Amino acid sequence: VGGYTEPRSVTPEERSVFQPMILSKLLTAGSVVSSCELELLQVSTQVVAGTNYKFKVSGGATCPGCWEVVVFVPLYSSKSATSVGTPTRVSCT
C-alpha cells in the first residue's frame, strides 16, 4: 500500500501547471533545448502528506526521447514547497 495509481490521462489543468515546471527542469538540467515541444503522456499519483505526480513526458523533433519526472505538491498547511524531482531517461515503449 502507499504506491502509485496506474498511469492515467493528464487533465487540462494538470498540463497547464506541470508541463512548464517539467520543461523548465529539463531545460535547467541541460537535458532539452529551449525550443523543446514537451508532451505529458500520462501521470500516476501517490498520496503521501501531499501528492507525488509521476509523469512520463515525450519530446518533439528538437528533443526526442522520454523522461520520467516526479513532482511533489505539498498540502497548503506545510512549510514545504512544490518540488520537481530529477528527470530520468526512459524508453518511450
Numbering used by the authors: 4 to 96
What do the paper's sentences say?
FhCyLS-2 from F. hepatica is an unusual member of the superfamily, where our sequence and 3D structure analyses in this study revealed that it combines characteristics of both families. The protein architecture demonstrates its relationship to stefins, but FhCyLS-2 also contains the secretion signal peptide and disulfide bridges typical of true cystatins. We determined that FhCyLS-2 is a broad specificity inhibitor of cysteine cathepsins from both the host and F. hepatica, suggesting a dual role in the regulation of exogenous and endogenous proteolysis.
The crystal structure of recombinant FhCyLS-2 was determined by single isomorphous replacement and refined using native data to 1.60 Å resolution. FhCyLS-2 crystallized in an orthorhombic space group C2221 with one molecule in the asymmetric unit and a solvent content of 48.3%. The final model of FhCyLS-2 contained 93 residues (Val4–Thr96). The molecule adopted a typical fold of classical stefins like the human homologues stefins A and B. In contrast to stefins A and B, the intact C-terminal strand β4 was split into two smaller β-strands in FhCyLS-2. Importantly, FhCyLS-2 incorporated two disulfide bridges into the disulfide-free scaffold of stefins. They were located in loops at the edge of the β-sheet and indicated as D1 (Cys39-Cys66) and D2 (Cys69-Cys95). While the positions of the C-terminal disulfides (D2 and D4) were similar, the upstream disulfides formed an interloop bridge (D1) in FhCyLS-2 but an intraloop bridge (D3) in the cystatins D and F.
